[PDB]
Amino acid sequence: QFPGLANKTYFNFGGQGILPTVALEAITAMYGYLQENGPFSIAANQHIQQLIAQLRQALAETFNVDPNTITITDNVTTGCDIVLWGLDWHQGDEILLTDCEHPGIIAIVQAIAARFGITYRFFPVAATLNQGDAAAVLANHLGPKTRLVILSHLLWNTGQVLPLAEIMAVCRRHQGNYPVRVLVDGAQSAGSLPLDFSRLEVDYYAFTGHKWFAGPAGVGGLYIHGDCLGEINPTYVGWRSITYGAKGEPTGWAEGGKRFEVATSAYPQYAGLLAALQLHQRQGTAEERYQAICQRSEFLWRGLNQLPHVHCLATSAPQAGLVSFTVDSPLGHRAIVQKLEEQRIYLRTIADPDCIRACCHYITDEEEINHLLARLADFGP
Amino acid sequence: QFPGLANKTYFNFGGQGILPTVALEAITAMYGYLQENGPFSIAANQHIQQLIAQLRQALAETFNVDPNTITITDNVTTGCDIVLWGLDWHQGDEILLTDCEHPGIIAIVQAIAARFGITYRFFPVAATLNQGDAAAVLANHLGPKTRLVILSHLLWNTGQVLPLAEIMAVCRRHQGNYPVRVLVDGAQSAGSLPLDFSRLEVDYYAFTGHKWFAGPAGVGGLYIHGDCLGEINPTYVGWRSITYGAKGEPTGWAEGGKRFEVATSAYPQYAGLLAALQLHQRQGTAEERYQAICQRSEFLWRGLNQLPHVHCLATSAPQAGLVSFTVDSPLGHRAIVQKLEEQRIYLRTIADPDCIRACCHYITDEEEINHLLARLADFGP
Ligand SMILES: Cc1ncc(COP(=O)(O)O)c(CNC(C)C(=O)O)c1O
Ligand SMILES: Cc1ncc(COP(=O)(O)O)c(CNC(C)C(=O)O)c1O
Ligand SMILES: N[C@@H](CSS)C(=O)O
Ligand SMILES: [K+]
Ligand SMILES: [K+]
Numbered sequence: 001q002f003p004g005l006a007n008k009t010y011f012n013f014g015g016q017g018i019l020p021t022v023a024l025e026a027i028t029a030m031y032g033y034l035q036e037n038g039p040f041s042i043a044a045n046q047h048i049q050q051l052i053a054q055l056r057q058a059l060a061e062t063f064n065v066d067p068n069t070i071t072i073t074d075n076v077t078t079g080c081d082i083v084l085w086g087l088d089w090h091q092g093d094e095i096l097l098t099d100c101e102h103p104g105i106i107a108i109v110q111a112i113a114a115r116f117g118i119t120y121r122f123f124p125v126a127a128t129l130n131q132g133d134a135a136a137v138l139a140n141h142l143g144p145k146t147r148l149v150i151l152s153h154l155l156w157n158t159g160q161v162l163p164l165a166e167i168m169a170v171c172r173r174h175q176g177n178y179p180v181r182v183l184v185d186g187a188q189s190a191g192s193l194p195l196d197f198s199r200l201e202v203d204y205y206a207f208t209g210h211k212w213f214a215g216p217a218g219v220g221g222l223y224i225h226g227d228c229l230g231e232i233n234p235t236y237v238g239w240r241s242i243t244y245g246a247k248g249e250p251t252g253w254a255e256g257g258k259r260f261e262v263a264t265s266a267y268p269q270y271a272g273l274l275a276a277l278q279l280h281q282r283q284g285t286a287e288e289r290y291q292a293i294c295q296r297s298e299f300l301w302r303g304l305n306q307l308p309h310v311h312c313l314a315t316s317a318p319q320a321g322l323v324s325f326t327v328d329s330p331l332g333h334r335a336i337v338q339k340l341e342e343q344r345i346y347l348r349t350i351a352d353p354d355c356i357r358a359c360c361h362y363i364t365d366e367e368e369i370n371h372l373l374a375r376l377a378d379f380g381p
Numbered sequence: 382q383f384p385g386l387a388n389k390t391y392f393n394f395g396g397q398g399i400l401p402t403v404a405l406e407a408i409t410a411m412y413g414y415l416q417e418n419g420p421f422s423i424a425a426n427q428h429i430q431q432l433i434a435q436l437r438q439a440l441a442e443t444f445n446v447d448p449n450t451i452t453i454t455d456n457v458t459t460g461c462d463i464v465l466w467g468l469d470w471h472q473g474d475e476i477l478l479t480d481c482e483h484p485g486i487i488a489i490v491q492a493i494a495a496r497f498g499i500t501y502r503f504f505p506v507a508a509t510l511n512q513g514d515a516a517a518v519l520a521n522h523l524g525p526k527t528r529l530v531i532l533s534h535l536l537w538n539t540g541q542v543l544p545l546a547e548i549m550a551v552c553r554r555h556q557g558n559y560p561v562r563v564l565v566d567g568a569q570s571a572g573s574l575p576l577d578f579s580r581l582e583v584d585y586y587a588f589t590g591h592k593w594f595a596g597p598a599g600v601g602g603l604y605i606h607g608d609c610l611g612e613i614n615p616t617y618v619g620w621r622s623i624t625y626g627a628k629g630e631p632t633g634w635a636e637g638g639k640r641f642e643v644a645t646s647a648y649p650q651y652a653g654l655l656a657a658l659q660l661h662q663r664q665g666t667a668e669e670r671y672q673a674i675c676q677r678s679e680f681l682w683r684g685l686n687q688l689p690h691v692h693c694l695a696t697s698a699p700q701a702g703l704v705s706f707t708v709d710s711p712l713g714h715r716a717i718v719q720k721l722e723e724q725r726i727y728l729r730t731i732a733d734p735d736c737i738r739a740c741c742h743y744i745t746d747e748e749e750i751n752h753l754l755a756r757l758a759d760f761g762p
Contacts, residue, residue: 004416015421016645024412031405031597035385039598040396041727042719074455077619077644085466085616104620104644107631111618210645216412217420218599218647234492235466236617238458239485248732250488263458263485264397264591266599266647338423346422351629 009345011358017214026275030268064196068256071222079206079222086232089116097150098125135166147178153189159322194286215273238263292362293321329379390726392739398595407656411649445579449637452603460587460603467613470497479506516547528559534570540703575667596654619644673743674702
């Protein structure tokens with residue numbers, strides 16, 4: 001089902017997943033449908049609307065929520081932009097972000113701070129991978145003007161799964177000028193951790209389809225709890241965002257998540273993500289896949305512990321499929337990742353902390369892990 | 382090269398262009414390159430950046446401008462959203478729009494009005510298709526508080542080519558509170574009218590590749606004159622928008638137009654637009670192509686004039702490839718467009734004014750036009 005795995009040793013799912021054959025077939029079939037029946041026509045436009053609704057529904061079912069809470073986007077970042085630019089910020093309002101957030105997300109925050117006169121402070125979570133409590137660190141940083149906390153459910157740099165439920169309680173127990181809300185960056189978590197937003201109570205959860213879900217680059221989504229929808233004003237909008245009047249004029253915002261969708265998008269790619277989502281559910285439940293992912297990451301982590309010059313950041317088994325580690329060598333992590341790539345072994349360098357990250361998916365196997373171990377064994381001080 | 386033309390009679394280029402074989406080949410080849418070399422790796426990431434640079438450069442050459450003025454987007458609307466949300470609006474600032482702008486664009490202006498307390502009015506341009514002066518109408522509406530004028534270079538509803546140069550001069554000569562700037566919606570003009578931003582001076586020009594340029598749905602762009610760049614603050618941003626420091630931290634904005642680019646997009650589609658652009662230039666100059674488009678639209682227009690129950694909105698030959706008309710019939714224009722599609726003849730209904738629109742491209746032939754005319758003749762009072 002995943003042809004790209006065969007002639008390589010891939011551990012970069014968190015960067016982009018290997019596209020399954022059913023996804024490529026769906027993409028290709030959609031271009032064909034458009035060429036045959038349109039591309040612009042009553043038939044083609046109806047087929048596109050039906051496709052969009054099917055993908056919105058598939059995502060909704062994935063997270064066990066109502067389709068109205070789902071916005072389709074192009075990537076994780078756009079979901080964060082929609083939430084951050086849509087909040088009715090006031091001068092002096094404060095945003096707290098962990099010290100492990102993506103530089104792109106930090107950039108939106110700086111842009112917001114410049115535009116609305118809000119302020120932002122980081123709180124340290126990287127150091128809580130093996131000890132401490134990230135929820136308690138947050139409690140020690142909440143203030144009177146704190147309105148939004150931004151965190152990645154699964155940290156892209158260290159592989160820690162933040163204690164989201166406990167963190168939500170902490171924010172909800174806080175008595176301040178604002179009911180503290182939390183925007184979750186789910187780039188690594190969605191598609192690997194079992195996520196059920198009925199059971200787990202969240203405010204805003206941004207994700208993408210091109211990483212753990214193994215969809216094509218260019219399609220992602222955003223979840224907004226039904227009760228937080230009214231707090232998010234549309235910013236980037238267009239013809240997909242509105243309801244229409246008698247003369248084709250705008251009369252209001254489209255229902256639910258649609259108000260945040262803009263204009264023409266890569267429709268064939270939506271069919272690709274839908275097909276990939278369906279393939280995963282056929283393999284087993286999110287829970288079974290998650291256990292399989294952990295089985296592989298612990299196997300890799302154990303092997304790495306056995307190599308004398310490799311040092312895993314985590315001192316206990318990985319909580320998900322990310323395994324970060326350093327290598328004692330005169331070379332530097334960037335050179336080591338390049339040398340591994342020359343051997344068709346694919347990992348990624350992490351800037352902070354300075355280390356190397358491997359991603360194990362449920363489709364990763366022991367021979368791949370053992371091959372990675374074999375090649376790393378050669379680096380030394 | 383344009384396979385989709387066979388077995389249908391297509392006049393919806395303005396909605397979406399028929400994708401050329403070279404474009405589909407380039408899209409498929411890109412998925413293949415990503416499967417073979419990544420999809421996330423040093424090699425794959427470099428190849429994607431190179432592809433992005435090639436597309437930006439090709440767009441730059443298309444309009445005779447420096448690549449630094451080009452932003453890659455997903456559609457026409459996004460370009461307008463970048464310009465509109467990026468300007469530093471103050472209560473009472475005014476935006477003037479023609480009375481023929483797209484509903485999605487009007488909706489952005491409305492969201493802006495609500496958030497910054499700006500105001501907007503329409504100047505009547507529709508009525509200038511056959512008489513009057515749109516530039517003069519603009520002059521009589523220009524005021525001390527007008528900060529920006531939004532207009533479609535080629536009107537999507539009536540097919541009028543607005544006097545952009547004159548209208549630009551009108552705006553330059555004005556003496557008001559703000560130096561008056563003009564944002565152009567080039568959904569219909571780009572790819573049909575010969576456009577040179579070195580010989581034609583514009584401030585902002587939003588376009589897409591999926592209409593007259595015949596690229597895939599999902600890739601477009603925005604031109605911002607260098608003198609206007611600083612006035613546009615990045616709004617939706619992400620990892621593609623910034624430069625990086627030593628610990629991978631944001632250190633400023635990416636070069637030129639890159640700062641308004643967000644995050645992961647459908648890269649294979651970029652290869653598709655690049656290929657469609659290169660084909661579009663393989664077939665004569667923009668002028669030769671524009672003359673061909675007009676030879677086709679005048680032939681349809683003339684033909685429609687001969688049909689007793691059809692009435693073209695334009696009383697002189699169309700200035701571009703759009704030919705709008707009404708039909709005298711109890712059926713209504715939507716039923717007629719549906720019936721035409723039942724015969725694999727593809728046109729579209731326009732909501733204001735109530736009419737039908739046909740798009741003639743340089744690849745449209747007289748047999749297709751004669752076919753549409755034979756079937757249209759069947760309707761009557
Ligand atoms: C926490 C997190 N947020 C946001 C993103 C940006 O992805 P989009 O392009 O979908 O907005 C990533 C991607 N990470 C990568 C690439 C990685 O860690 O290898 C991420 O890990
Ligand atoms: C003037 C104008 N502006 C903006 C758009 C929206 O395009 P994007 O999806 O690329 O933002 C269109 C679309 N027209 C159509 C569909 C038509 O003429 O049939 C348009 O004609
Ligand atoms: N290439 C950078 C972009 S920051 S989202 C990275 O993925 O680390
Ligand atoms: K070790
Ligand atoms: K007539």
